[PDB]
Design a protein around this nucleic acid. Structure first.
Ligand SMILES: [Mn+2]
Ligand SMILES: [Mn+2]
Ligand code: NA
Ligand code: NA
Length: 327
DNA sequence: CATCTG
DNA sequence: CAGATG
């Protein structure tokens, strides 16, 4: 957690680069189990050899560790932090819609910067366009104070369309967090479930409304269950408009809301522990359901949940306020 | 994993 | 349809 820090870090820089610049998924994947195992490792790695001793630890990495250990740096790492081509990809990649794949093409075409991008707005697709248009707003975090307003709106509109809608703002916003990154909304309705054959309108009607009133400003992606968009709190008394915010909304069959709801709320760590325990208590949990574990090895059957209460209950656990879902 | 692009 | 982004 701090004993093998640098090493686990450099390994990361390294892994990262492989996958993003080169395509070295293998290699990339290599750095990772490695930093993963060095990470767990209880002592102070005093040398390569010592390391090598580990699983996932090859000669090549051992090598690298030596050099890093020996000297506060790694040549290779130094060559990559300079290299403008590598740099570009880590950059372009910052645009919503631009993955690495695309980061490469553009570079090979000479688009390396934001301007480059604007000038060639033709090569970018819709999402990519949007991402470009909101690059700034995009990277700005979401203050709770805004979150609450947002939430307030969303909830009032969903309600209006159907008193029967059930909406939840999961995410950290749900876990306490003073600021968030995007707004994740879980959606269900009684009339939608496991078996119930669809009802796309269920998601579309609200999406409309949100745009009706102008909260939703653009569409990133719009499926029958998931909507990726952009929204925005009405600029008040003109002088201070709000940044544009990433927003996602997803429909869920009523019969698997809370699992999801729990699930989305995290934290990852809270989950696992919950999952691990769930397992003890003779259960299995996932994004959609909790299931009574048979002994034969495994086994299932959807346990019935009517809240997050029902869940914990199952695992015979302490109902955790979302704040304490931390870890 | 669900949506888009081409 | 494979492949890419989130
Ligand atoms: Mn979030
Ligand atoms: Mn999200
Ligand atoms: Na991106
Ligand atoms: Na293939």
């Amino acid at each position: 957690e701090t004993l093998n820090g640098g090493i686990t870090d450099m390994l990361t820089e390294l892994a990262n680069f492989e996958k993003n610049v080169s395509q070295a998924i293998h290699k990339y994947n290599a750095y990772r189990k490695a930093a993963s195992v060095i990470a767990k490792y209880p002592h102070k790695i005093k040398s390569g050899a010592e390391a090598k001793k580990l699983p996932g630890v090859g000669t090549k990495i051992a090598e690298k560790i030596d050099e890093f250990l020996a000297t506060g740096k790694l040549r290779k790492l130094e060559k990559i932090r300079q290299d403008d081509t590598s740099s570009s990809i880590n950059f372009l990649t910052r645009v919503s819609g631009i993955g690495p794949s695309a980061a490469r093409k553009f570079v090979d075409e000479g688009i390396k910067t934001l301007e480059d991008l604007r000038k060639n707005e033709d090569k970018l697709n819709h999402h990519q366009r949007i991402g470009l248009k909101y690059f700034g707003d995009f990277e700005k975090r979401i203050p709770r104070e805004e979150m609450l307003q947002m939430q307030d709106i969303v909830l009032n509109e969903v309600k209006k369309v159907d008193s029967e809608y059930i909406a939840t703002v999961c995410g950290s916003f749900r876990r306490g967090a003073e600021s968030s990154g995007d707004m994740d909304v879980l959606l269900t309705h009684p009339s939608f479930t496991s078996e119930s054959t669809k009802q796309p309108k269920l998601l579309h009607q609200v999406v409309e409304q949100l745009q009706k009133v102008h909260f939703i400003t653009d569409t990133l992606s719009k499926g029958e269950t998931k909507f990726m968009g952009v929204c925005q709190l009405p600029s008040k008394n003109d002088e201070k408009e709000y940044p544009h915010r990433r927003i996602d909304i997803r429909l869920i069959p009523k019969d698997q809301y809370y699992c999801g709801v729990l699930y989305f709320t995290g934290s990852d760590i809270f989950n696992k522990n919950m999952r691990a325990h769930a397992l003890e208590k003779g259960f299995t949990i996932n994004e959609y359901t909790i299931r009574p574990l048979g002994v034969t090895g495994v086994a299932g059957e959807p346990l019935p949940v009517d809240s997050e209460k029902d869940i914990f209950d199952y695992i015979q656990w302490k109902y955790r306020e979302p704040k304490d879902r931390s870890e």
